[PDB]
Design a binder for this molecule. Structure first.
Ligand SMILES: CCOC(=O)CCC(=O)O
Ligand SMILES: CCOC(=O)CCC(=O)O
Lengths: 128, 129
């Protein structure tokens, strides 16, 4: 015979533990340093493979050229720290929540990293 | 006003991409050397984050002390490569499949790494016969 099993919500469970390690700042290999004009400088630790799984730009960024081993600090301009936070939070939880006055900004940052999922979601809200 | 959104199958999508990165050996930070008895040696590269998310044992051994961040080679003992390769494939696909005269072996390695999900499924197959 042959025996097969599939834990249905495993990915949801496994991703929740991935977010835990991200808040616990454990097993991280990248540090996003965001700098926007007239904005406090931010700093976001994350896992390269997790961001690469949610954005083709993060994936192409971390798999091309000479990459730092252990911990790679990546400088980032053109996106506000608050927007870079919601993007990471979506990648780690598959959920994104902002105010009415920031959907356009989040949508723009979503396009900058080709997170197509929250691009279309921001579109449905703006033109409701 | 507020806006909320939830990609329900996102976690399945991102895990599929993470399985590709494993099969392409890109961004991997651990290499598991599995030599069981006299079986032919085998190596499995993976991401410590993914393994820590599916196994509390892998999480404990990757998030304690000072690990040489870069590419850690870890020797695995007491488990057969065919079973190990399947536990890794479960961690990246959430699906496991093996033979009948075999459920005992992957249940042991699953118990060895505290993957309760597939431990109960194997136990519920031995009882049901
Ligand atoms: C330019 C900063 O404005 C924002 O986009 C704030 C982001 C947010 O509150 O979700
Ligand atoms: C000793 C290795 O045990 C196995 O993994 C058996 C594999 C199988 O029969 O499907």
């Amino acid at each position: 015979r042959t025996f097969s099993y599939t834990l249905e919500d495993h990915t949801k469970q496994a991703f929740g533990i991935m977010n835990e390690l991200r808040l616990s700042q454990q097993l991280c290999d990248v540090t996003l340093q965001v700098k926007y004009q007239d904005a406090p400088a931010a700093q976001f630790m994350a896992h390269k493979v997790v961001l690469a799984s949610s954005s083709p730009v993060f994936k192409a960024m971390f798999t091309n050229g000479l990459r730092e081993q252990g911990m790679e600090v990546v400088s980032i301009e053109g996106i506000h720290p608050k927007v870079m936070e919601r993007l990471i939070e979506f990648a780690y939880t598959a959920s994104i929540s902002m105010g009415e006055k920031c959907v356009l900004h989040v949508m723009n940052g979503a396009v900058m990293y080709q997170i197509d999922s929250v691009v279309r979601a921001c579109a449905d809200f703006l033109v409701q």
